[PDB]
Design a binder for this molecule. Structure first.
Ligand SMILES: *[C@@H]1O[C@H](CO)[C@@H](O[C@@H]2O[C@H](CO)[C@@H](O)[C@H](O)[C@H]2NC(C)=O)[C@H](O)[C@H]1NC(C)=O
Ligand SMILES: *[C@@H]1O[C@H](CO)[C@@H](O[C@@H]2O[C@H](CO)[C@@H](O)[C@H](O)[C@H]2NC(C)=O)[C@H](O)[C@H]1NC(C)=O
Ligand SMILES: *[C@@H]1O[C@H](CO)[C@@H](O[C@@H]2O[C@H](CO)[C@@H](O)[C@H](O)[C@H]2NC(C)=O)[C@H](O)[C@H]1NC(C)=O
Ligand SMILES: *[C@@H]1O[C@H](CO)[C@@H](O[C@@H]2O[C@H](CO)[C@@H](O)[C@H](O)[C@H]2NC(C)=O)[C@H](O)[C@H]1NC(C)=O
Ligand code: NAG
Lengths: 593, 99
């Protein structure tokens, strides 16, 4: 009966918030002071935490989920009674982990050898990505691009074909029709008096919103192609799909490395204040104190005190072995900290706002039950970080914080260099982000059979992205699997949804801030109403659905992409003038070979 | 939770004051002596108990809870729990989780 489940979950919370703490503390202590003793000590803490959570799952199964009247205790049972794994035969559980561990090692250890010099070989990140980020030699890039797929991608293909079976048996045994729908499960909402949402309804709202982005994207594609024809003469058709090896990395995921090739007005220096930070003699403490001044200026709470001593903002004075990768940490017990190794830079001033914007989210739902202390969906959690960096990147913020002079002036040509540099990150990836998820949603349901996995992929790169194979491919490759998110089993749809929600939140706070200008100039400062509408959504955690948290900030019960397009209307108006004599969109029939 | 008129897990099951309390409440932060990095599980608390307390019941009685209709003779498997838990006090806790 229901009231027993309240008391069972009260036991779980008071047990879990402590096991979670000393586990995540041992993980922190390892990350900041790496030794094999610290590896062992963090691993067997993570072990004893996992061992508790799975025992409590079989004890949570004991409760009838359908009898629960309370919605909050019901979310906590549903999230603990989940089976996830185990449902398999144990030899198929062992085989699945063996395959995942094998795709993980092949992706990370993967060497590509130079055919000119078979004694020299490159991992993925050192040298092989660097050619794709900084070379302008079409043949050196094409060599790195096709060698990654023909040397490493061909080893991931035969693993992916067995992983797709084991994932779908597990999803079915959990009663989802396929493992693509198991992932979608995050967004599911039921019984909440008009705020409900289906797993499948995500696919229709993605495909309804994405075709409002296509008009903006097709002019950005045409402009990028018209510039790349000067970097790569004869290699590109003025109506062609873009060859994949030219797009700034190993996959073409973001177009942002093409800024230096594509720039509107490069003789106007796109703004920096790193020089102002070093001439004002700022340090890691100042960098974060002027970031804190922004959150208290919008009316949010300040650092949880013990943050300042228990955080690491700098690489130590001791020659310590540590991971300096910037990360906001929550460890429970109200213990919020931030691990990074900052260097006096505006990129770091803006990462300080981005990561502090994660801590500022965690603190609002600290009063929720433990099982509910997460974002309203997997997309919101980076989107609530970035809107602080959007604020801090403005020249209005930078002149109020003393990083720009009172006599510094913004010219139109600086604004369009800025918005194009943004669009190559924010908009250029959205076809790839819908398409890679569409391909996995089609693979897990079997709408693409294994004699069409690679056939369908390059028809979709050509149709949805306007991007084309430099060399023909076949079912002995797996170009999707040549990527971390596909080889390490990570659902990508959180990035599309987060990139929509981000601009809805931006424009809702802009209206509260009485904002008189274009959406991109907008600063979250000295505004009170904005902080109040923000905090009243931030403090809900998982307890209320994302479908309701949106109408709290934005006024809308679902995702809307108009605000993202309204960040870019000044740029799109310019791109149209830069495309009048040109061809817009692409021919799917064209190939570079 | 420590007052006349207040409610909560302590105020129902550990420490009640009369709602017209003749007296005062004093408290001070004790991270610097009550907590150590190993987890000072020394302090316990009544997480579960039947009915409710009266004011000033220091009821040391320690037997397994049991909710709804189940018998329970120890083991504490399901719907029945040992009534006490420790505080996990550590000097690295945040302010509201400090001793
Ligand atoms: C079940 O729902 C009720 C309300 O629908 C929640 O009751 C509130 O509980 C808090 C303490 O947690 C009280 O301060 C409020 O005054 C209560 N309000 C009402 C209207 O009951 C209850 O918390 C829910 N159950 C759980 C486990 O959260
Ligand atoms: C979780 O997996 C189990 C199979 O291991 C599913 O079947 C349950 O079997 C247990 C006995 O091991 C029974 O106590 C349960 O009653 C069975 N399921 C229920 C509650 O009907 C079980 O269905 C799976 N649970 C989920 C999340 O669907
Ligand atoms: C930035 O603003 C200037 C100032 O208006 C623009 O220059 C005008 O451009 C149009 C179209 O070529 C001309 O008809 C005007 O005569 C120009 N103004 C002057 C004072 O010469 C410029 O085009 C804008 N740049 C962008 C990228 O929008
Ligand atoms: C935005 O907030 C800042 C911080 O409070 C305000 O800065 C103050 O500005 C006045 C006059 O401009 C100075 O006398 C104060 O010394 C400033 N305070 C600090 C702490 O530096 C700023 O005025 C606010 N903006 C608006 C439009 O009110
Ligand atoms: C909202 C709030 O109280 N913020 C406080 C501020 O008042 C105080 O001056 C500052 C000193 O560290 O710490 C923070």
């Amino acid at each position: 009966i229901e009231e027993q489940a309240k008391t069972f979950l009260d036991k779980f919370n008071h047990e879990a918030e402590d096991l979670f703490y000393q586990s995540s503390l041992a993980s922190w202590n390892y990350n900041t002071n790496i030794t094999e003793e610290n590896v062992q000590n963090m691993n067997n803490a993570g072990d004893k935490w996992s061992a508790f959570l799975k025992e409590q799952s079989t004890l949570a199964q004991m409760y009838p989920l359908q009898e629960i009247q309370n919605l909050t205790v019901k979310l906590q049972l549903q999230a603990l009674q989940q089976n996830g794994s185990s449902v398999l035969s144990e030899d198929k559980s062992k085989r699945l982990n063996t395959i995942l561990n094998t795709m993980s090692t092949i992706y990370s250890t993967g060497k590509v050898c130079n055919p000119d010099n078979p004694q020299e070989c490159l991992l993925l990140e050192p040298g092989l990505n660097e050619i794709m980020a900084n070379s302008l030699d079409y043949n050196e890039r094409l060599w790195a691009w096709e060698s990654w797929r023909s040397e490493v991608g061909k080893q991931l293909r035969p693993l992916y074909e067995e992983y797709v079976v084991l994932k779908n048996e597990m999803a079915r045994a959990n009663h989802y029709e396929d493992y693509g729908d198991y992932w979608r499960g995050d967004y599911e909402v039921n019984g909440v008096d008009g705020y409900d949402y289906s797993r499948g309804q995500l696919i229709e709202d993605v495909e309804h919103t994405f075709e409002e982005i296509k008009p903006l994207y097709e002019h950005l594609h045409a402009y990028v192609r018209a510039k790349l024809m000067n970097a790569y003469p004869s290699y590109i058709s003025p109506i062609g799909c873009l060859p994949a090896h030219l797009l700034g990395d190993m996959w073409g995921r973001f177009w942002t490395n093409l800024y230096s090739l594509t720039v509107p007005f490069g003789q106007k220096p796109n703004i920096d204040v790193t020089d102002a930070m070093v001439d004002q003699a700022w340090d890691a403490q100042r960098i974060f104190k002027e970031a804190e001044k922004f959150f208290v200026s919008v009316g949010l709470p300040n650092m949880t005190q013990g943050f300042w001593e228990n955080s690491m903002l700098t690489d130590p004075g001791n020659v310590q072995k540590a991971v300096c990768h910037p990360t906001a940490w929550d460890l429970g017990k109200g213990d919020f900290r931030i691990l990074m190794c900052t260097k006096v830079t505006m990129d770091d001033f803006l990462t300080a706002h981005h990561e502090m914007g994660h801590i500022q989210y965690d603190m609002a739902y600290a009063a929720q039950p433990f099982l509910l202390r997460n974002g309203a969906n997997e997309g919101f959690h980076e989107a609530v970080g970035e809107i602080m960096s959007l604020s801090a990147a403005t020249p209005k913020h930078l002149k109020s914080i003393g990083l720009l002079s009172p006599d510094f002036q913004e010219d139109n040509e600086t604004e369009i260099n800025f918005l194009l540099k943004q669009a190559l990150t924010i908009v250029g990836t959205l076809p790839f982000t819908y398409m890679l998820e569409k391909w996995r949603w089609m693979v897990f349901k079997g709408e693409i059979p294994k004699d069409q996995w690679m056939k369908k992929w390059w028809e979709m790169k050509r149709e949805i992205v306007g991007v084309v194979e430099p060399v023909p491919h076949d079912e002995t490759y797996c170009d999707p699997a040549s990527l971390f998110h596909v080889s390490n089993d990570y659902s990508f749809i959180r990035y599309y949804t987060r990139t929509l929600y981000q601009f809805q939140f931006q424009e809702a706070l802009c209206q509260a801030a009485k904002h008189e200008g274009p959406l991109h100039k907008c600063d979250i400062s000295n505004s009170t109403e904005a902080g109040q509408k923000l905090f009243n959504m931030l403090r809900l955690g998982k307890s209320e659905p994302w479908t309701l948290a949106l109408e709290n900030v934005v006024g809308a019960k679902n995702m809307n992409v108009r605000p993202l397009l309204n960040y870019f209307e000044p740029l799109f108006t310019w791109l149209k003038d830069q495309n009048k004599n040109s061809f817009v969109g692409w021919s799917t029939d064209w190939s570079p070979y | 939770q420590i007052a006349p008129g207040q409610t909560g897990k302590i105020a129902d099951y550990n420490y009640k004051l009369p709602d017209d309390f003749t007296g005062c409440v004093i408290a001070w932060n004790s991270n610097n002596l009550d907590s150590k990095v190993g987890g000072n599980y020394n302090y316990l608390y009544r997480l579960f108990r039947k009915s409710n307390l009266k004011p000033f019941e220091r009821d040391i009685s320690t037997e397994i809870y049991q909710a709804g209709s189940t018998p329970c003779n120890g083991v504490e498997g399901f719907n029945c729990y040992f009534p006490l838990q420790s505080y996990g006090f550590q000097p690295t806790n945040g302010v509201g989780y400090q001793p």
